[PDB]
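From: lab user (bench 3)
To: helpdesk
Subject: output format question, protein + calcium ion

Hello, I'm new to running complex predictions and I'm not sure whether the block I got back is the full result or only part of it. Here's what I submitted:
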Amino acid sequence: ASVHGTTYELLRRQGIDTVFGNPGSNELPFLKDFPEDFRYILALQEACVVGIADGYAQASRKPAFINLHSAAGTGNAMGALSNAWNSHSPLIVTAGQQTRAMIGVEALLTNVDAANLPRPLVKWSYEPASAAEVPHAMSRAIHMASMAPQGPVYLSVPYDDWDKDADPQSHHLFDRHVSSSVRLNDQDLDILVKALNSASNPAIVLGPDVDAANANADCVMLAERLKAPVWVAPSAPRCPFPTRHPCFRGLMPAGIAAISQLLEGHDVVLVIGAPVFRYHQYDPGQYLKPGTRLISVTCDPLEAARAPMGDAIVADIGAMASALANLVEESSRQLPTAAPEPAKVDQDAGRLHPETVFDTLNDMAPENAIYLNESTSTTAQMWQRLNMRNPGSYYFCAAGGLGFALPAAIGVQLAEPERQVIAVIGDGSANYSISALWTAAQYNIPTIFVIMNNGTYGVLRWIAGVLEAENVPGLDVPGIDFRALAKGYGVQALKADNLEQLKGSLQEALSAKGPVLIEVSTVS
Amino acid sequence: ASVHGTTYELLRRQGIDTVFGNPGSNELPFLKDFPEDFRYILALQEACVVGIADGYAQASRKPAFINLHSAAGTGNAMGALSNAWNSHSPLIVTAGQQTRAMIGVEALLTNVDAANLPRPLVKWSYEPASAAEVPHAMSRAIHMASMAPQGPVYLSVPYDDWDKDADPQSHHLFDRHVSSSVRLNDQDLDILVKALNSASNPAIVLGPDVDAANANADCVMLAERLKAPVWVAPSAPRCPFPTRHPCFRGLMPAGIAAISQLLEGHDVVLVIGAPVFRYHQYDPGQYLKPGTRLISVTCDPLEAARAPMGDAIVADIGAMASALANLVEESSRQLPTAAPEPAKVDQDAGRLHPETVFDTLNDMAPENAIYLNESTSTTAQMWQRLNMRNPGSYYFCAAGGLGFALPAAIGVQLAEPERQVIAVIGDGSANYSISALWTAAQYNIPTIFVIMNNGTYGVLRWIAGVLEAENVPGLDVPGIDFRALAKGYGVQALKADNLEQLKGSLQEALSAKGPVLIEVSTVS
Amino acid sequence: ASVHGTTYELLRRQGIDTVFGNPGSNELPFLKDFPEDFRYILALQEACVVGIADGYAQASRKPAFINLHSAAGTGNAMGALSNAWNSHSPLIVTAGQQTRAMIGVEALLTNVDAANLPRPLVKWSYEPASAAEVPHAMSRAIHMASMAPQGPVYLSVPYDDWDKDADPQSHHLFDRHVSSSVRLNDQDLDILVKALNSASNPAIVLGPDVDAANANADCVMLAERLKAPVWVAPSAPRCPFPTRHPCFRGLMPAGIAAISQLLEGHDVVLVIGAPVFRYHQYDPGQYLKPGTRLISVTCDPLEAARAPMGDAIVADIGAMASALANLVEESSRQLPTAAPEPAKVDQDAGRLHPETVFDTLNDMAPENAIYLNESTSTTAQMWQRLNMRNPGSYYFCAAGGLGFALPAAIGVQLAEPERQVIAVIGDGSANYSISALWTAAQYNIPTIFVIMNNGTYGVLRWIAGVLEAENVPGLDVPGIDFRALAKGYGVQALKADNLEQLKGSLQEALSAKGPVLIEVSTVS
Ligand SMILES: Cc1ncc(C[n+]2csc(CCOP(=O)(O)OP(=O)(O)O)c2C)c(N)n1
Ligand SMILES: Cc1ncc(C[n+]2csc(CCOP(=O)(O)OP(=O)(O)O)c2C)c(N)n1
Ligand SMILES: Cc1ncc(C[n+]2csc(CCOP(=O)(O)OP(=O)(O)O)c2C)c(N)n1
Ligand SMILES: [Ca+2]
Ligand SMILES: [Ca+2]
Ligand SMILES: [Ca+2]
Ligand SMILES: [Ca+2]
Ligand SMILES: [Ca+2]
Ligand SMILES: [Ca+2]
Ligand SMILES: [Ca+2]
Ligand SMILES: [Ca+2]
Ligand SMILES: [Ca+2]
Ligand SMILES: [Mg+2]
Ligand SMILES: [Mg+2]
Ligand SMILES: [Mg+2]
Ligand SMILES: [Mg+2]
Ligand SMILES: [Mg+2]
Ligand SMILES: [Mg+2]
Ligand SMILES: [Mg+2]
Ligand SMILES: [Mg+2]
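Helpdesk reply: Thanks, we reran it on our side. This is the complete output you should expect:
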């Protein structure tokens, strides 16, 4: 068998059936004879390729496979890899290299020192030393991406390797099963359970690895048993809990002092599937107030090591959440009271308040909708105003890197064809990966894109105001016609300049057979 | 509190009480006011510092703390770090940096791009961005070294940071407990146990992480229940099993074909705490024969990913071994029969056969002796001829890097004062870290060093013969007087030119109050 | 032709005829059939291998070739590479890798991520992607080491590559000539010359790249024409000027304030072949006083970029020094007056003051002796007391990393068989690379080693005193018998406990046919 044939068999045997890519000449020898049982999803720029694959992997809860062109294609994707690292997304990134005989002279298209290029944003990065090693290296890539803590990996392959003979002993790779589905030993788990049972006023904080593990329902059971309020850890990339459950308390503010104040009076705080903590703003103060003990369950040693406080347990989130939910006592304390509905912001017949947009989406969208957020000044209101009952209902760029949501929404919609995906994206953010729209058109992936157009990088104007920073350039983005961009890439386009038009456009979009972009005029 | 005071409190609260070091000026501000409850162990060269610390960590089963001088001191230690990486040794390597104000001009003693220097041989490598970050960075280092899979880490600290004010909130670091003591979830563990119970002819292969976890006794129980032969995985850095137990089958040859042949007819092979596999010689063939399934339990994702065959489970070796030993059925098959005693090699009244040396050590040494091996042509015979009943009884350079055993034997002896340490070291290997002898003299650490003097790099002459490689330079090392080297560093020195003298010298050495070196004339 | 044959032909055609090495199994396929016209120089540890090669390269003013064993051998050499980087030493470091078929499984002796291992201490680091690339990669290594700014490079070669067929077109590599012998364009050079001619009170500062270029005599002419005092730049790795020439002003103190004060009143300061500046101690103040302009000529862009003051010209030191010396006007100012002889320190009949040792060496040594310094508390006095008339007469560890001088003195003596090499090494420093002594014995390289034994890391005790740092551990090194160490490695050993014995021992050493070590009892 050839390296080509062996590698595709390995991929198929390991459950991979889709290649997200933007092709080049170093990749043609890999892409030729493309298997009839695989799908290729083309995107027009590599940030888009990786974003689509990332959304697909996150929503499918399985690895996604990417093929890019040498250094320039890899390089174009590195912002996307920054997000993927923070979301623990299991992405297998392959890039074609020059033929081995031309690497030394650094022919055009040589990826120099290739494995160093994507560092430090990958778990493993490698170029094999021979053609017959390629299937083994691919096996390593698959497993490295997939083991806890999941994350992106990189493999560079000289284009002449594909046609060479494989090692017949590579067949042992095909059916390897590698598990990291582990949990704390019984003795120490019993100690933890007793500490949770004995707590007088426990709180729970959940992060994105809960949703990645589909541990959401187990966390609901845990919170109900402990009668504990539940927060989502700051800078949330996913939604780990039903947002109208009585225990839910919303998104934690991403500040040191704000979080210790919120946790004051809680004697034990159990954090599951989050860094401790993904703070953002400068908000100096105490990590915890006196009287609060924190215990973190994380899938990632790097998270456990860097927490500035608390105990930690490094284990699989699904296995731990299930074990805890089934072991803790039913507390006789009263169940927390649900948060009240948010206020309705006064809305005239003109430009839309973001609150109006979210309220309207919540009213009109199906109960199993999936939302993506890249409307950076409106996140708090989004979190208050969308009732997200189900797992996998929210994504936000995990490293804060713009250009995620537009392509990722396409990948999520591909992963979840029965769930309507609605991406709410600022006018600034929309440009970073605008060409991703074409993939939705070409493959008829019926994502709805809601562009919040206020003409500016609004959160940056806000921060500049707080900082008292005057004379900052580059914060306004006037003069972008998003309906024309949508037409450019073949996506149906609507506008909404007021609430009546918003409702009309959403009605049209929800019933459409293809992707739709709605340009919403929002308050500036 | 100062950064100095806070950092030493963190170290003490995390169980560190010893600093292995070779000082320099960038380290004086750290070493000043050295705490009265800490011990400093000086060695004369940094390979020696790290080797001593490594032996101490491996034998104590706890992290060891190292302080080196900038780039040159770190650099001198990098061969030692190569071994430490392969043995999963929990080493916290700190190095002093220039004062922050002089780093930009690259003053003498500046460690340029410091965190990259020890890569790729460390789990984590870092220089903090401010003085007040130093205690937090130290906390990260401690936990990164200590979490499974354990390994060396590196922290560079500008010398002016120590006297600066610490963050008062660093007190939250002091008592953090971080656990990776995890095992496979119950459902999947029950599947594994059923597969072991159903095997008709199981075999067990054990690696160094078993001995590191002190899982040896649990593995004895497991092997007895399964009635299974037990091998030690190739290139063994430690001894994971009693070598005269009836199930023991010795050291696996480090070749692909040799191992698949050895495992032929075993339907399930359970590998615990080893890479799959640390092959060495070129010995192409099948990874496994038809009819053999392999299942690996490893603490290291990198091991699980790179195995060319078998299933894998990534979990703590101690937790897994205990769980398996207590869950499997007692097989009604007959217990394996003990290996017979090895043959006595004919020995005249002249130079010693290595077999004679090992037989004599086995006769005369206490039953709780600890052996180190850096006698590279004699490893197979050593493994056959030493009855090692207890855990922690054997160490061999885990990356094959010479210069480990001489210093490591000192660190092991420091860790285990009641167990006589005997390092068996070739005349070639003895030179790499010869100055370590001084530390044994200075601190009166009563290690016995047995120098096997045959005048040559014997295993290289052997390999050159197999390869039919003629005219190879540099394989002979005549003209070294090891008794004079021992005198040079203040260690009592004996010679043994024949068996009678070997017995006499060993008798003297075993009853000595300090370290002793015996130069043995072995067959060439 | 094989890769082996082609590579050795390339080496020979590029002027390489010596391999400095410590062998291992990955290197046996390279070392077999070793060419009869090459020499192999064995050393017993890799810091020693690289130090010997470094001294040889520095003194010969040509590249030196090194062969080490995989990661552990490379790692043992990294402290030596730290010095080599700072001295711009043209070292071609090769290391053997596992056979390509075993790299993926990380067999024992695999150098993982090999090219990253020696970073950041090499100019270029590489592992070829195929066997036929090896000769081209070797060509790249040779030229990268040799082009200005010279420095160490690293090449990792899988052991199976050597026996493979080479590309016949590799013959084009053999006779390539690559020049960096460049100087500033005429127009801008004329501007510089006019600025030097117009200076009222010029000063010259010279660094190690002057001695490396053998630009010393041109710098003498330049200083004589300009009637300018001449200093050696701080932390000097080499001696660039005759130390009793009337213009010579000695070693600059390695402090910011001290240097600007020394240069005060000099209107133009011309720095040639030095960083600006290799400061050491914290000595904050002005980089230059008002009225001083600095102009630097450096072979190294990294030096030019990081200078905190002055103009810079990046060019070959030999070409620039010759051009300037021949273009400047003869100033009618008076030639500077020679420094007076240093004082004689009172010396009783007991332990030796270091000043006494240097005065005695200066009296008794030949006028073409070559000195190496690793006696760290005595450098200032050494510089004042040795009359070094000729180029290539002084070496000191360029990164401050101990373990350089003992092996480097052997390499210098090998390079310069007619010039007596005398290494003056502290008792602390002597241990780092003590096994290098064996190479001097084995090859009968007649270096004289003068061990300054004061029982302590003296400069560290001194600095601790200045810092007012109390309770510092690890600063004393009692109990080392250097005559026994010398006997251990087959080197003739003498002692000197007082001046009469020093003179007697030096007389014996200077007339000896082989290497000699003299242990001198110096004041503590
Ligand atoms: C790749 C990338 N570049 C720049 C930024 C900085 N950034 C953060 S938010 C923001 C403004 C986004 O504006 P918009 O999407 O219109 O949302 P608004 O703040 O107006 O709600 C910018 C540029 C970033 N996070 N990522
Ligand atoms: C740091 C380092 N350098 C070189 C080697 C290569 N090496 C492997 S075994 C060996 C010979 C050791 O000789 P000796 O200790 O006398 O034992 P013998 O083979 O004679 O039993 C050498 C040099 C290595 N493994 N590590
Ligand atoms: C590899 C290395 N480790 C440690 C140091 C720190 N160091 C600088 S000077 C010095 C003391 C050397 O003592 P010695 O050679 O006896 O000379 P003395 O200071 O007594 O004159 C030490 C350990 C270093 N520069 N390089
Ligand atoms: Ca509503
Ligand atoms: Ca799906
Ligand atoms: Ca906006
Ligand atoms: Ca016996
Ligand atoms: Ca102990
Ligand atoms: Ca030997
Ligand atoms: Ca004199
Ligand atoms: Ca010469
Ligand atoms: Ca000294
Ligand atoms: Mg990079
Ligand atoms: Mg293959
Ligand atoms: Mg258990
Ligand atoms: Mg490195
Ligand atoms: Mg602090
Ligand atoms: Mg379970
Ligand atoms: Mg060739
Ligand atoms: Mg010109």
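A quick orientation on your result: Chain B has three domains: 1-178, 179-340, 341-524. Let us know if anything else is unclear.
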